[PDB]
């Protein structure tokens, strides 16, 4: 147990879940998270973690999920989906959804995907989107609309047309650079009283990764 380059990497992983109403009510929401700390420290130091709303320990040199929280109040909803459905005869279905990014322009949400579900009397789907790239997968049955990367606070609409046939909510997905829970690693004091390497002598690394689990929005 002895390294020359002393580092450690804090992983704050999340999964923000949402449940909205066609109008705009947050019928349900919460986030589940665990913090993994990948370290390589010399000796057997007793640490001091920090954060918002601080567990002390002696890290199992290697990799170990420190704690694991699960907030439910005052949550950050990374995206804001808002659709518009217009009926006609029984021939066509007018549908326009719009996603919104609610975060610091200095951050890029990636791996975005909206799934606007169609009905079973579907004959053909037409769609246009100045941004992104979508298609109507008849098997899964929906208009998978994928987006490479999207900045924050910006807007983006996708207008489709479901050609009905004579005779569910829009799910979303996304990875982010920040933690929706609001959490934040304040400090991680590395202390091995035996050996000569200090705390402000270590290289600390921390990353925030928010995944979207159940981000459905009633149509």
């Amino acid at each position: 147990i002895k390294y020359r380059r002393n580092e450690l990497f804090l992983d704050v992983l999340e999964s923000v879940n949402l449940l909205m109403s066609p109008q705009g009510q947050v019928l349900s929401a919460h986030v589940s998270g665990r913090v993994v700390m990948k370290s390589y420290l010399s000796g057997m130091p007793e640490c001091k973690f920090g954060m918002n709303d601080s567990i002390s320990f002696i890290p199992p040199d290697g990799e170990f999920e420190l704690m694991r929280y699960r907030t439910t109040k005052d949550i950050i909803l990374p995206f804001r989906v808002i659709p518009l459905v217009r009926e006609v005869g029984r021939t066509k279905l007018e549908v326009k959804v719009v996603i919104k990014s609610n975060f610091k322009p200095s951050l890029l949400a990636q791996k975005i995907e909206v799934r606007i579900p169609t009905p079973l009397n579907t004959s053909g789907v037409q769609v246009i989107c100045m941004k992104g790239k979508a298609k109507y997968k008849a098997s899964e049955n929906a208009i998978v609309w994928k987006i490479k990367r999207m900045a924050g606070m910006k807007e983006s609409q996708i207008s489709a047309e479901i050609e009905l046939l004579p005779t569910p909510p829009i799910s979303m997905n996304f990875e982010v650079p920040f933690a929706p829970s609001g959490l934040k690693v304040r400090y991680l004091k590395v202390f091995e009283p035996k050996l000569n390497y200090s705390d402000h002598d270590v290289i600390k690394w921390v990353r925030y990764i928010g995944r979207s689990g159940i981000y459905e929005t009633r149509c």
Binding site: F9, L10, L108, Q110, K111, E175, V176, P177, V185, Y187, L188, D199, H200, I203, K204, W205, V206, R207, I209
Partner: peptide, 10 residues
Amino acid sequence: TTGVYVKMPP
């Protein structure tokens, strides 16, 4: 950036 780490501000 999504997996890129970042130095903490002690």
